[PDB]
Amino acid sequence: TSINCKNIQSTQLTIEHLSKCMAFYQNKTSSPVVINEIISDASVDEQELIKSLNLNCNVIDRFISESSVIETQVYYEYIKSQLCPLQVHDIFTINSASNIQWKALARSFTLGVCNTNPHKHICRCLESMQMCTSTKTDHAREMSIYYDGHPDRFEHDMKIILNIMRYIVPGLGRVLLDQIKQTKDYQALRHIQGKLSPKSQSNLQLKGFLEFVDFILGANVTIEKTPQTLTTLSLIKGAHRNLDQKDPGPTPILVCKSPQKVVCYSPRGVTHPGDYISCKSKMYKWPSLGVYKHNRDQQQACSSDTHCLEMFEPAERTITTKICKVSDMTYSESPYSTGIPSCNVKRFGSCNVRGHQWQIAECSNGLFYYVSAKAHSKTNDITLYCLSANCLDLRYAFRSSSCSDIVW
Ligand SMILES: *[C@@H]1O[C@H](CO)[C@@H](O)[C@H](O)[C@H]1NC(C)=O
Ligand SMILES: *[C@@H]1O[C@H](CO)[C@@H](O)[C@H](O)[C@H]1NC(C)=O
Ligand SMILES: [Cl-]
Ligand SMILES: [Cl-]
Ligand SMILES: [Cl-]
Ligand SMILES: [Cl-]
Numbered sequence: 001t002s003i004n005c006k007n008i009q010s011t012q013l014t015i016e017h018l019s020k021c022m023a024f025y026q027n028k029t030s031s032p033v034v035i036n037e038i039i040s041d042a043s044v045d046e047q048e049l050i051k052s053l054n055l056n057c058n059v060i061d062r063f064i065s066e067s068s069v070i071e072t073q074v075y076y077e078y079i080k081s082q083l084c085p086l087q088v089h090d091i092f093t094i095n096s097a098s099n100i101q102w103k104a105l106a107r108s109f110t111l112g113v114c115n116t117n118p119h120k121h122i123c124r125c126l127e128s129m130q131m132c133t134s135t136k137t138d139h140a141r142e143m144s145i146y147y148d149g150h151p152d153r154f155e156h157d158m159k160i161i162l163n164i165m166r167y168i169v170p171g172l173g174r175v176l177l178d179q180i181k182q183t184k185d186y187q188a189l190r191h192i193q194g195k196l197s198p199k200s201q202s203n204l205q206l207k208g209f210l211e212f213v214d215f216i217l218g219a220n221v222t223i224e225k226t227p228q229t230l231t232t233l234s235l236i237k238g239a240h241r242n243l244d245q246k247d248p249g250p251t252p253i254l255v256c257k258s259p260q261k262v263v264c265y266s267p268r269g270v271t272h273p274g275d276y277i278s279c280k281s282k283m284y285k286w287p288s289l290g291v292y293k294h295n296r297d298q299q300q301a302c303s304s305d306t307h308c309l310e311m312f313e314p315a316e317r318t319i320t321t322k323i324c325k326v327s328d329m330t331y332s333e334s335p336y337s338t339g340i341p342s343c344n345v346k347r348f349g350s351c352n353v354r355g356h357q358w359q360i361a362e363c364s365n366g367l368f369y370y371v372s373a374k375a376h377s378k379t380n381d382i383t384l385y386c387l388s389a390n391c392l393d394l395r396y397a398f399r400s401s402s403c404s405d406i407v408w
Helices: 015-021 035-041 044-051 060-066 070-083 085-092 097-108 121-128 140-147 151-165 172-183 186-199 204-217 233-237
Strands: 259-265 274-279 282-285 291-293 300-303 323-327 342-353 356-363 368-370 376-378 381-386
Touching: 015 070, 015 172, 015 186, 035 044, 035 070, 060 070, 060 172, 070 085, 070 172, 085 097, 097 121, 097 151, 097 204, 121 204, 140 151, 140 204, 151 172, 151 186, 151 204, 172 186, 186 204, 233 259
Parallel strands: none
Antiparallel strands: 259 274, 259 323, 274 282, 291 300, 342 356, 342 381, 356 368, 376 381
16 A cells, blocks of 8 residues: 555554655655655645754755654654755665665675675675675575574674664655664565665665665564553654743754753644754754763754854744644754774864864764864874873863864
């Protein structure tokens, strides 16, 4: 059957049916549509809700991962299918740019089945992108011996495979993959890979990988599944913590004092709940780059990173008309949330933040850090620098966008 990803029903909130709403499954490979045209079918309030987000092809996956309600995530995934066809389908072109990530992971995270007999064609496919044409047919009996009746190993390799596929289907596909990982419902992966394979026939490497995913999904093993507990519009409607005061902040702010998570949905018509943050009981838009703990005061919330350099945008004016449930605060677990005392420095530079110069370093991970005036390298590595004076205190990355006039 077919479903409407713009207005997904309660019965259709399963991995089997949610997989039909992955952007690539829309079979739209060209002609991007402007955002104002994509959203003209929906309600006026939903239209203001989306226009307020300033969606583009660079931020829509972050809005998808950052959203809390599954209907909203599906909706933004459809918007991505309409807004970024080339980006959505670039992975299926052989050796394309979008292929760099999954292959990379495939070389770094060796499967457990590749510990012995590394000349198997699946191992050479993930390691050197060779023999990808015979991944399932080569040594299928030995790999069956390795997998059948061995749930431990099977789960190891399945986790590796899911992590690999998180870079093949970004957005909704990643949500479904993490859901599979949490529920251990490994057979449900057939609803994803089963839709990827007929579109990967030209990408011979991806084709071989997906064929092996099929093979391992056929393993004679038994694992009991964990309940799904996926957040739906129904969970939001049937919940407490109602807010009578839904007033938006007058002006944008940097520091969110007394933060609370908020999820707001319109009372009538088809709606997709929007995410907001309350700061001193004033409504602000939840940023696509995540909410972080202020490094200067960890009971305060910042947008995009821990330095409170990015402005919180006040909520739309119609927020008072919508219903709002307070939700538990969720902070970002991205690398910008965790501080480090030292790093291997690629280069030192100077950057103009808030109108003043600051010595910065780009570490090997690509992140930018303020560099202590007492920074120094460690004994056995000329690139390994203490970012703090005592080489113990943690220092947090900041987005390069808060810089201007970077000088290397
Ligand atoms: C896209 O093509 C697949 C076949 O590969 C089909 O199952 C699906 O329904 C199509 N999506 C549409 C028509 O929206
Ligand atoms: C799977 O393995 C078991 C042994 O654990 C075996 O008895 C059975 O025949 C195999 N095939 C199945 C269950 O289809
Ligand atoms: Cl087309
Ligand atoms: Cl993510
Ligand atoms: Cl810092
Ligand atoms: Cl950045």
